[PDB]
Amino acid sequence: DLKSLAKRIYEAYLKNFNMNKVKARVILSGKASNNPPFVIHDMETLCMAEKTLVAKLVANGIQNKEAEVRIFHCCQCTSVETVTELTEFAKAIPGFANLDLNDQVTLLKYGVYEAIFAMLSSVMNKDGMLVAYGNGFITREFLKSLRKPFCDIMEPKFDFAMKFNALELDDSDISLFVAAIICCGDRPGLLNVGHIEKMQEGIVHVLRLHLQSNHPDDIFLFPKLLQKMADLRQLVTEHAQLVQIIKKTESDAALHPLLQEIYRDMY
Amino acid sequence: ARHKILHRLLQE
Numbered sequence A: 001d002l003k004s005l006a007k008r009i010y011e012a013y014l015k016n017f018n019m020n021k022v023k024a025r026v027i028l029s030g031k032a033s034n035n036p037p038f039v040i041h042d043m044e045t046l047c048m049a050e051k052t053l054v055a056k057l058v059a060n061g062i063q064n065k066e067a068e069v070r071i072f073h074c075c076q077c078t079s080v081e082t083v084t085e086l087t088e089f090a091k092a093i094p095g096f097a098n099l100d101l102n103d104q105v106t107l108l109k110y111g112v113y114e115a116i117f118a119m120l121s122s123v124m125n126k127d128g129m130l131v132a133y134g135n136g137f138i139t140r141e142f143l144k145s146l147r148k149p150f151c152d153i154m155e156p157k158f159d160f161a162m163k164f165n166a167l168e169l170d171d172s173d174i175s176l177f178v179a180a181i182i183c184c185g186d187r188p189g190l191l192n193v194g195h196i197e198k199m200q201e202g203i204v205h206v207l208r209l210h211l212q213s214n215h216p217d218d219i220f221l222f223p224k225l226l227q228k229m230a231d232l233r234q235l236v237t238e239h240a241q242l243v244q245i246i247k248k249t250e251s252d253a254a255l256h257p258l259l260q261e262i263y264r265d266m267y
Numbered sequence B: 001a002r003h004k005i006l007h008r009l010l011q012e
Ligand SMILES: Cc1nc(-c2ccc(C(F)(F)F)cc2)sc1C(=O)NCc1ccc(OC(C)(C)C(=O)O)cc1
Pocket: A040, A046, A049, A050, A053, A054, A071, A072, A074, A075, A076, A078, A079, A080, A120, A131, A132, A136, A138, A143, A153, A154, A243, A259
């Protein structure tokens, strides 16, 4: 069971996420490439990127909507796809599918954004992040140049990602970290807390062992990761607050049904 | 219903 639990979770991760750290790092390496990612660094390049990567946003009057609204829409589409992948990944985590459906819903509801921000680190560097399935790269400075409140969304995530990337984790490490995030026994409204705590204990057990053999020169890596879990929960609570503000003040930023479900009565 | 989409995704 535990001897190869890490390998299985890792397989589920490689099978369910179209983008991971090894793939992202190759694209960001700057090495010779036949299809380098299109850089979005200003309004001009944003329109060019939309024309090729999401053509629908350059026609039908949509090109007349604020850049911020178009970017926010793309952010939503991206989150919906990631939530969809995380749901399939969760179903592949040993024991998750055995939980009562309500508990499965609750774990994903509170855990998906912690996992999303942790995984964002994989496609980010200090200057920006990969988007559109690795075909685009939007700069950190461009996002900062947007008008509030849209320019206030990404900075905290970039800051988190820089400190997270400093841990030099690889996909095998990340797959276990994400599983631990999802199988969290203290989420509000859980029914079988005991059952979930048992799953988490096993995952944390294999994670601790994995870090010991995969990262021998950093004896504090495990506690560092525990702190990251706490940092992520805070990052999500603050993000939800901003999302609620955008919902109440932005006329063309209505949330996609799935995202609305997730944030409804979250924090 | 509450969480209609998540419930659906989980049951497939
Ligand atoms: C910053 C960014 N740009 C994208 C991008 C992609 C493509 C294109 C292109 F034009 F097509 F190239 C431009 C920009 S996709 C993207 C992103 O997903 N960043 C992370 C993020 C941003 C906002 C979030 O809040 C919402 C409310 C959506 C949520 O909580 O789900 C969450 C996460």
